[PDB]
Design a protein around this nucleic acid. Sequence first.
RNA 1: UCCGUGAUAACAAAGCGGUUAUGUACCGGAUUUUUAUUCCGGCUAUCGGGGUUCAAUUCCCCGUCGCGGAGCCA
RNA 2: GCUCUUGGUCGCGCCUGCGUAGGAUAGGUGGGAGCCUGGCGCCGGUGAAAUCCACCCUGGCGCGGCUGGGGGC
RNA 3: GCCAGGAGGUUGGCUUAGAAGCAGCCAUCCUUUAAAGAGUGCGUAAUAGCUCACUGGU
RNA 4: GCUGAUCUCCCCCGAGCGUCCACAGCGGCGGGGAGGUUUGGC
RNA 5: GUGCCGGAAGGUCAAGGGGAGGGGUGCAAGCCCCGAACCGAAGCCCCGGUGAAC
RNA 6: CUCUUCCUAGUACGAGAGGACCGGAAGGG
RNA 7: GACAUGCGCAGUU
RNA 8: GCCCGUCACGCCAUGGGAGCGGGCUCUACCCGAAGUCGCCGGGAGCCUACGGGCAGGCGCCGAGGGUAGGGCCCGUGACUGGGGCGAAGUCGUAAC
RNA 9: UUCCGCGGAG
RNA 10: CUCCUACGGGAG
Lengths: 124, 234, 190
Amino acid sequence: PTINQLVRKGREKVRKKSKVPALKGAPFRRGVCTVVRTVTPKKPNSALRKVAKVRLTSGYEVTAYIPGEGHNLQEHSVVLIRGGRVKDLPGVRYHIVRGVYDAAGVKDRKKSRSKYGTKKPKEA
Amino acid sequence: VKELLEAGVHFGHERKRWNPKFARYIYAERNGIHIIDLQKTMEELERTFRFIEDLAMRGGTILFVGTKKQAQDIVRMEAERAGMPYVNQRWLGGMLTNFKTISQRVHRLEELEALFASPEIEERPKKEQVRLKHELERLQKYLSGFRLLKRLPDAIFVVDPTKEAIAVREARKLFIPVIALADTDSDPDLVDYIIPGNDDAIRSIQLILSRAVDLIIQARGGVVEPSPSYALVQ
Amino acid sequence: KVYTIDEAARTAKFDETVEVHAKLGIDPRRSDQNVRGTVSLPHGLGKQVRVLAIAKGEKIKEAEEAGADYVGGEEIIQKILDGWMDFVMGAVGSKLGRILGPRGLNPKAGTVGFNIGEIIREIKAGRIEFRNDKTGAIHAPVGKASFPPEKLADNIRAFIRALEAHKPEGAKGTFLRSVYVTTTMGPSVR
RNA sequence: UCCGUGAUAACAAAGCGGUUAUGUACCGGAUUUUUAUUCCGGCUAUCGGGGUUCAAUUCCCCGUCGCGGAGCCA
RNA sequence: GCUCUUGGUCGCGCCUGCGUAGGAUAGGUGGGAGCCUGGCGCCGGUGAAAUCCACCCUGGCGCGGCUGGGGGC
RNA sequence: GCCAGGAGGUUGGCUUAGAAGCAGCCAUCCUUUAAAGAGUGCGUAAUAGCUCACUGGU
RNA sequence: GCUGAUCUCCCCCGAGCGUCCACAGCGGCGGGGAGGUUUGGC
RNA sequence: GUGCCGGAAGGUCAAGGGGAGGGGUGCAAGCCCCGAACCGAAGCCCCGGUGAAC
RNA sequence: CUCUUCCUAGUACGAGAGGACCGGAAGGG
RNA sequence: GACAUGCGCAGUU
RNA sequence: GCCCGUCACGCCAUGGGAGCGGGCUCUACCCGAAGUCGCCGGGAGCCUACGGGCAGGCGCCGAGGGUAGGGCCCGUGACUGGGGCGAAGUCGUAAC
RNA sequence: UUCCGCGGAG
RNA sequence: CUCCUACGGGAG
């Protein structure tokens, strides 16, 4: 593109899309679990990943993943959506912040616990 | 003495199938052929032999090459008549560039040259008597002038460069002073000491190659008469 | 002419080659033909017919002297059976299946003369005179006749081969006369 | 009722007097990864009787059924 | 009036007939033992045998009777 | 009408948590002696009072 | 209009349900009537 | 399947042509009668096309 | 012909959670 | 968005 | 070997859609507060130091309100159209 | 933080 | 829009 053209047209700034619309650029968004099923892996995996749809504050309703082993979310459990795609399940673009609201931390996790909201146990 | 000789019948060569680079060395186009400017030729001859001489007096070996028939034989002469290595047959690929490996054969030569005269000849089946004997015929057929010194040349002289540009290349990658008698069907640039002049008419070849070897010897002691040049020279 | 001209048969050899070739008519409804076995005939022809007698090993003295040239018995039943060239012609009357050496190796053979007294006698009439000639598919007729030796005597073809008109249903007209043979043949009203 | 005309095997369809055409559908068996194809082979016949003939799907007769045409009794 | 051309009919006139064995393009039953002026004729086999005379089945050809169609002038 | 004792082993089985007539399902005997009440009957937690199915005097 | 199967109505009996208790309130299977508003018959 | 169009073959087909053969009469020639083959149109059968033909 | 609201009274009764008989007013359709 | 009380500050929803 | 598109099943967004709901705006005319300004202050009132002032009357402007007819955007809608993605379902073989 | 007197404290 | 009231008006 010649200068003159540049003078006319000019370069165009990109502007990218939110890999995750959790509303008002919010660290997190709250909401109720409308449903709690159990989908299946993508391309090369096999298992019963646990997913749950959520009616968000913002009149929104979306699928959120659930971490660790076992849990306790029901058809009407209040929960916190964190925002983390699960590249292996089409759609799932948010994780549920464990150990918050109706979300129960992980029982007996001893390793990484900051993630999974598990309280620091005593060794006595 | 110089001029006359050349002016005799040793200039002007290839016609209309030249190289523009070589346009600095050329007088005109008579009836078709390119008449190389000898005036300049001379000048170059100088710097060339200067080098040769400034080398022939410091114990340096030169390697001559000429794989073309209208210049084979002579080159075979001027070389032996100077102890300077040379190539008259098929200039193997990677000689200079893969010397160590090519040498390996030179060694194989004597390997047989020795088994040639021996009592071990009493045995050995006709299969090998023919195999080896033959394996030597050719062996000896290509290195007859590529043995002498088991060390790379300090330079190399040649007839038609482009004809043997491959050797030239090898030379150039290994950094080795390149000197040669090239005509209009060649590119100077990649030639260090350029002897501009006919590369096919043995007439010019003999001459320029002759006074070259002498000059190689003038710096060694033993100035004599020329070498066998005529035998069927037209 | 008028009736017949037997004398009209006026070259060759003994012209016994005389015949009744008058046409016919196919079978009306469900029927056919059949020549009366040994059709009487007011002639004898002076023939030494080689009448065969389906006798046995007992009738070999009269079966030969009754009007037959030679006669065989049962020692030729399955004896003349080992050749397609080894085998008149009568047949064992009654229900006896003479069709054992006669049912295989095709010629002519059927009903014959009866007499459980002897094959020969002075009352051995009708058994060397006339014979038969039935349906020919294409057109039967084609009968026999004497020879060039008789005037109005040869006129037997009439009340004989012509009076053969006895067996036939009804679906046409049995006619189209023609008499003679081995030379040519004329024809006149029947 | 009367004249003529067709007829075969489960079905389809042949051989204008000289001894099991043939195709389908059906049952095998070969080959094609499978299937379809292809090949090879096998099929409860000559509409039913009775005639003519050395010999008949073939010509003759009688019946049943389909076909087509003319009359029936009034 | 005159031509051209095709049918159906009775005549008559000569052909017509290539199962498997087999002298080989055997039609059918009859007469038959020699006529041609050189084949006999059985052969040995074949369901059936050859020369020649017949009357005839199938189909075709060629003149005639008697009836018919279509084209032209 | 009225006086009166309104007898005792009877408070037996399922369910009892309560049949022990007076939750309901099964019994229906014995009795010392004025008879008898397999005590039909108001209840209550079963029991715990009255009522005649028993009679002196009038 | 006659008739009253059909129909609307109520009645006898009383299984059985109602903690106990044919009947507070229900009523099995079955039976008897009334009325002439339905559908029909003549 | 029906209609219509197309098919110089076949099948069937009325008069008429044709006369095998038979009958009534007469003394007769004759006069009269029935009458098979076969030749015989359109129609129909049969073969085929056809839907902005039913 | 009938309804409503008000005073007796939120009193008799009442695990209650509400709510009268009898009797007397005043508006409506 | 709406504001008790005290003097926009602090505080409530 | 690879590989195409229809079809079936599941999840998601999305177009069309008789329409239905709400937000923003434009135009027009009808009523029209407070208030400024402009007339008047007459046959009525108040004050005067007679000039004049106030009260009150009328008009223009006018927030908004009403009625009407437009424009722009969002939501939602029986059904309908395709599209994306989803280990081993159907039909055939287009392409290398 | 319903703080102490903009300056301080919580 | 919220409040107060002696329901007659007022208040923020």
